[PDB]
Amino acid sequence: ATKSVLMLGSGFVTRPTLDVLTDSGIKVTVACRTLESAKKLSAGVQHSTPISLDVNDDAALDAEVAKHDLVISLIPYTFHATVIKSAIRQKKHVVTTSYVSPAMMELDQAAKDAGITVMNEIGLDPGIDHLYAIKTIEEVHAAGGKIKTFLSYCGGLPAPESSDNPLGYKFSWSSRGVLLALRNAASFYKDGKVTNVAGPELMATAKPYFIYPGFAFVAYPNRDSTPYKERYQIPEADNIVRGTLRYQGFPQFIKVLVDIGFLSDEEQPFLKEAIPWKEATQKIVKASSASEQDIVSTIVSNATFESTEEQKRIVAGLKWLGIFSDKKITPRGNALDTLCATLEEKMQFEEGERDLVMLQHKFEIENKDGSRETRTSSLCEYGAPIGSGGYSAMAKLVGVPCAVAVKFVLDGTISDRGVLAPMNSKINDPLMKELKEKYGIECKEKVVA
Amino acid sequence: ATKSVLMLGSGFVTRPTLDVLTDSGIKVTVACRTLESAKKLSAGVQHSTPISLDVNDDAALDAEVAKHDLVISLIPYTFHATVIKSAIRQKKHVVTTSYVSPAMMELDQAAKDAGITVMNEIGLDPGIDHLYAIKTIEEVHAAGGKIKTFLSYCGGLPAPESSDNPLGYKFSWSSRGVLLALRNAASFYKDGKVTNVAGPELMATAKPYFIYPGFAFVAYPNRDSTPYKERYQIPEADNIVRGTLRYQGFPQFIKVLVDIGFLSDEEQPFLKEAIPWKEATQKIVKASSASEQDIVSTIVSNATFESTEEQKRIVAGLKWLGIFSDKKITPRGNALDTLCATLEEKMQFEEGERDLVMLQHKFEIENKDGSRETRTSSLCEYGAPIGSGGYSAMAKLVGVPCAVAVKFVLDGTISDRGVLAPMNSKINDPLMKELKEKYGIECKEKVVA
Numbered sequence: 011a012t013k014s015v016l017m018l019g020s021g022f023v024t025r026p027t028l029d030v031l032t033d034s035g036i037k038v039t040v041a042c043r044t045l046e047s048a049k050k051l052s053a054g055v056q057h058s059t060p061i062s063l064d065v066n067d068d069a070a071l072d073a074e075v076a077k078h079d080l081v082i083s084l085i086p087y088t089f090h091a092t093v094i095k096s097a098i099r100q101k102k103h104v105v106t107t108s109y110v111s112p113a114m115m116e117l118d119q120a121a122k123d124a125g126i127t128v129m130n131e132i133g134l135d136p137g138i139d140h141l142y143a144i145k146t147i148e149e150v151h152a153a154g155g156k157i158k159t160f161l162s163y164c165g166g167l168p169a170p171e172s173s174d175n176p177l178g179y180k181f182s183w184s185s186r187g188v189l190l191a192l193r194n195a196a197s198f199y200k201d202g203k204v205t206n207v208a209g210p211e212l213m214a215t216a217k218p219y220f221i222y223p224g225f226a227f228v229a230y231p232n233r234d235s236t237p238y239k240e241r242y243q244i245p246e247a248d249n250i251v252r253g254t255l256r257y258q259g260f261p262q263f264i265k266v267l268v269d270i271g272f273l274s275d276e277e278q279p280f281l282k283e284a285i286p287w288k289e290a291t292q293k294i295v296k297a298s299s300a301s302e303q304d305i306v307s308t309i310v311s312n313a314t315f316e317s318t319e320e321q322k323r324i325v326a327g328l329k330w331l332g333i334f335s336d337k338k339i340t341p342r343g344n345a346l347d348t349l350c351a352t353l354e355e356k357m358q359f360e361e362g363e364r365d366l367v368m369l370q371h372k373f374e375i376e377n378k379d380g381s382r383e384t385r386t387s388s389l390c391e392y393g394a395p396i397g398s399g400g401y402s403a404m405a406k407l408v409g410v411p412c413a414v415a416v417k418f419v420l421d422g423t424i425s426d427r428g429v430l431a432p433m434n435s436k437i438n439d440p441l442m443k444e445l446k447e448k449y450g451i452e453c454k455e456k457v458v459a
Numbered sequence: 460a461t462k463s464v465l466m467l468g469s470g471f472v473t474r475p476t477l478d479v480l481t482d483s484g485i486k487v488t489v490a491c492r493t494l495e496s497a498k499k500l501s502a503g504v505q506h507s508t509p510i511s512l513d514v515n516d517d518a519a520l521d522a523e524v525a526k527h528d529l530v531i532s533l534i535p536y537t538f539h540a541t542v543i544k545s546a547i548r549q550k551k552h553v554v555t556t557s558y559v560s561p562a563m564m565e566l567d568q569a570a571k572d573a574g575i576t577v578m579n580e581i582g583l584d585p586g587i588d589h590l591y592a593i594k595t596i597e598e599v600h601a602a603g604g605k606i607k608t609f610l611s612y613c614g615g616l617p618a619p620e621s622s623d624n625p626l627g628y629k630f631s632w633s634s635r636g637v638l639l640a641l642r643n644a645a646s647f648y649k650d651g652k653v654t655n656v657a658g659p660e661l662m663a664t665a666k667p668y669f670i671y672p673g674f675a676f677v678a679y680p681n682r683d684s685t686p687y688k689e690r691y692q693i694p695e696a697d698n699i700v701r702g703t704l705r706y707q708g709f710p711q712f713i714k715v716l717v718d719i720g721f722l723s724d725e726e727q728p729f730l731k732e733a734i735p736w737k738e739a740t741q742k743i744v745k746a747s748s749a750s751e752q753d754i755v756s757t758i759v760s761n762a763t764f765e766s767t768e769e770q771k772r773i774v775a776g777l778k779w780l781g782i783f784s785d786k787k788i789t790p791r792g793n794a795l796d797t798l799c800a801t802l803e804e805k806m807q808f809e810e811g812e813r814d815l816v817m818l819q820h821k822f823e824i825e826n827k828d829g830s831r832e833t834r835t836s837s838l839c840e841y842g843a844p845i846g847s848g849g850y851s852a853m854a855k856l857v858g859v860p861c862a863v864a865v866k867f868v869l870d871g872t873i874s875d876r877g878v879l880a881p882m883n884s885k886i887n888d889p890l891m892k893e894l895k896e897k898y899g900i901e902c903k904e905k906v907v908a
């Protein structure tokens with residue numbers, strides 16, 4: 011029985027998924043709104059078919075979904091609920107590398123009634139991080155140990171040698187997704203109590219986070235970690251934090267953008283016209299003139315800087331992006347998306363450059379015999395150089411786990427119905443085994459103290 | 460006329476030199492005290508012959524030197540004068556990748572009278588750094604520009620992903636050489652005036668040095684840079700500094716070892732006996748007991764720490780080295796060498812790991828038209844993974860330049876007699892050309908401001 015999969019999306023993390031599936035003899039229809047993008051991804055790939063499809067078209071989506079055994083939603087997570095509803099009425103399975111949101115979880119019973127499996131959070135973060143966090147936690151518990159502290163930090167960044175731009179950041183996955191993640195309020199456990207961080211004040215929490223001597227990482231909380239007390243079954247943990255890693259200087263730069271209104275997704279009439287960046291910025295920052303001096307004067311009066319050195323650096327970075335120039339904007343209605351169009355222009359990985367994925371779990375453990383130790387679980391991988399034809403570390407670590415999950419749902423290895431995530435050794439072990447043995451993907455443990 | 464070369468040494472940087480020369484049809488005799496070491500390096504290498512030879516034996520040295528056209532001194536630099544005296548008697552050329560010291564310079568006229576060329580400072584640093592520092596300086600001057608500031612920083616370190624040990628450092632070249640360099644007094648130009656740093660206080664001058672967002676580099680002055688005002692012909696420079704790069708935390712750790720006397724090369728009777736580290740450390744630090752508590756007590760009272768966190772870190776690192784344990788020391792007479800034996804034991808690169816060479820020149824320029832700009836010349840290279848059979852970045856960037864120089868002295872490309880260094884475009888250009896076009900070795904320029 012030849013299997014067939016509908017892959018929604020042809021972006022950053024899709025090629026590895028397409029490769030793994032077609033290399034298994036599974037037919038894959040690659041679908042997104044821009045036919046050309048779908049063709050480019052599937053060009054030369056055996057068993058693949060490119061088509062144009064907008065998930066907003068219910069009739070069109072249902073007709074295509076009905077032609078396959080399962081749908082992979084590798085598109086903006088805002089669309090997952092819609093995709094699941096289509097899969098439910100067509101009785102087809104679903105796989106995503108996104109968080110299970112309340113909207114998605116609401117469809118759990120309906121999914122079960124339709125007898126379908128909606129497997130989520132099986133990319134890098136969320137995904138691989140869950141697999142190895144749970145692996146260690148269950149091991150410790152089985153040994154009568156206690157997890158007093160659970161930390162999990164991850165960052166998809168450019169390799170240090172390829173990080174030379176004002177932001178120390180280049181895109182390896184959804185550009186707008188990156189900006190959206192920069193506004194997420196966070197919550198976590200510290201010294202046994204819940205600590206909250208409001209979205210608009212996320213960057214200010216950034217602190218240097220030491221992993222290895224050679225890296226200059228800074229970190230900030232990632233979304234709400236408190237539910238993991240129950241999700242990972244670690245009620246004894248006083249500290250529980252899932253965080254994000256960036257390079258020195260990044261958060262301060264973002265903070266300024268947030269403070270002057272550049273991460274606002276509020277529709278502005280003036281942002282639908284291709285006006286010069288000078289003017290767009292003037293309106294966004296609310297400066298009295300499109301002059302660089304006036305714009306900067308307003309920005310400095312409304313932003314925070316750790317020092318005059320920082321201020322000089324960030325302002326020069328903003329200028330580098332071209333927001334003070336005559337170059338016309340790519341009108342996208344709101345500041346966030348309009349800025350995003352220019353970021354996509356200037357922060358792309360170039361020939362010969364590579365990305366880097368750093369993922370590290372840290373466990374403060376209290377052994378059964380009252381003894382204490384510190385354990386780390388790490389994954390540090392560089393992507394293949396641009397122009398080599400190889401995968402970036404991000405695409406590999408997201409797309410491969412995704413493909414493995416798809417194959418498991420198709421062959422019944424993952425058989426629970428409803429809206430799921432990698433939260434049971436029943437499916438986590440098989441996932442880890444395949445990723446390790448067949449692809450060399452794994453987190454390595456080590457006792458640090 | 461088949462050329463023959465006597466390569467003294469078979470350590471870290473020799474394999475690339477041996478490979479390049481023998482691949483050129485040049486016969487090479489690999490010589491050092493330990494016959495097995497010479498054999499291991501030349502095993503399977505065409506045109507190579509391994510022998511045991513101690514440069515301290517004048518008669519044996521002259522006899523061997525006389526059989527070749529040129530001698531490469533890839534051994535501790537304390538031996539260069541001795542090697543050159545032998546080369547002078549035998550009228551043979553010499554090449555080293557070491558600094559021209561006063562002792563070596565004293566032999567300049569005798570070398571000239573013997574008609575031989577003694578080419579030095581043609582490794583990575585000193586070496587490649589000289590080549591590209593001069594290249595840019597002469598370009599700017601030819602354009603009527605002024606070099607107001609000249610900075611040159613270089614570090615041979617483990618790649619960030621391979622830097623996971625208490626020191627953030629692993630050996631890629633002479634272990635004791637590394638330690639010796641940590642005690643060198645420094646001097647440089649700052650704001651038009653000479654600034655001196657005493658050897659014992661070198662580590663305290665370390666400051667974060669920004670190059671790329673991803674790296675966490677710290678830097679300190681490297682030896683006396685003041686002579687370069689004349690050496691590089693930049694009398695108009697207000698700031699002139701040649702420095703070294705290490706990773707965050709390294710200098711503070713070394714500072715402690717220096718303060719408690721671990722970098723002393725004073726012969727101690729008790730350090731000639733394979734006693735437990737506990738005891739050795741006790742005597743060296745002068746603690747009232749071999750107890751971990753007493754030793755640490757003495758250390759904390761005699762060392763400096765930026766914070767209690769730092770103190771905890773460094774003490775844990777020292778314990779990691781095992782100087783508080785029962786393990787017997789490898790008796791080497793003095794603290795520096797005795798400690799070195801243990802460092803060599805614990806700080807070696809392991810399977811799959813790799814080093815990193817970061818070299819960057821920075822020039823603050825004042826153009827002819829009064830305009831100003833900042834230029835950087837960079838080289839950032841990772842070494843082949845251990846076990847791959849490839850060269851480390853250090854071995855490649857030291858050994859290849861050395862081999863090219865040897866070939867140039869042999870065919871006459873470098874013909875000036877006496878004690879030399881890469882200080883003239885006459886020989887620097889050919890050196891850079893060959894290294895760039897044949898091996899892809901070069902520093903890339905860029906205007907930063």
Ligand SMILES: NC(=O)C1=CN([C@@H]2O[C@H](COP(=O)(O)OP(=O)(O)OC[C@H]3O[C@@H](n4cnc5c(N)ncnc54)[C@H](OP(=O)(O)O)[C@@H]3O)[C@@H](O)[C@H]2O)C=CC1
Pocket residue numbers: 018019020021022023024041042043044047063064065066083084085086087107108131132133134135136137182183184185187408
């Ligand atoms: N778990 C993890 O660790 C990670 C998860 N992800 C998740 O993976 C998903 C995809 O990420 P990534 O590949 O980087 O995304 P990209 O932004 O690169 O690509 C998104 C793709 O979705 C398509 N798309 C957008 N809107 C529609 C629509 N209305 N109908 C059909 N297709 C549409 C695009 O279509 P079009 O061609 O028409 O523009 C495009 O091909 C996201 O949900 C992201 O958050 C990403 C990285 C890591």
Ligand SMILES: NC(=O)C1=CN([C@@H]2O[C@H](COP(=O)(O)OP(=O)(O)OC[C@H]3O[C@@H](n4cnc5c(N)ncnc54)[C@H](OP(=O)(O)O)[C@@H]3O)[C@@H](O)[C@H]2O)C=CC1
Pocket residue numbers: 467468469470471472473490491492493496512513514515532533534535536556557580581582583584585586631632633634636857
């Ligand atoms: N310019 C640059 O950028 C760099 C320059 N260097 C310089 O290169 C030289 C070699 O460095 P590296 O390869 O790392 O050194 P290692 O410490 O790895 O090896 C030194 C070698 O010299 C040999 N040796 C020591 N004493 C004697 C002796 N009495 N007679 C004969 N041989 C002896 C050793 O001999 P044995 O087998 O008997 O023990 C060993 O093979 C040094 O002077 C170093 O400072 C190094 C790195 C970079």
Ligand SMILES: N[C@@H](CCCCN[C@@H](CCC(=O)O)C(=O)O)C(=O)O
Pocket residue numbers: 087107108109134135136164165166167183187191232253254255
């Ligand atoms: N947290 C790291 C790793 C990137 C993981 C990206 N995953 C997306 C998932 C969004 C979704 O589809 O639900 C994210 O925003 O965390 C970093 O930011 O560098």
Ligand SMILES: N[C@@H](CCCCN[C@@H](CCC(=O)O)C(=O)O)C(=O)O
Pocket residue numbers: 536556557558583584585613614615616632636640681702703704
């Ligand atoms: N300065 C860098 C690069 C190491 C180059 C080592 N060269 C030796 C040369 C000694 C000699 O033979 O004269 C040095 O000590 O700088 C670093 O320290 O990491």
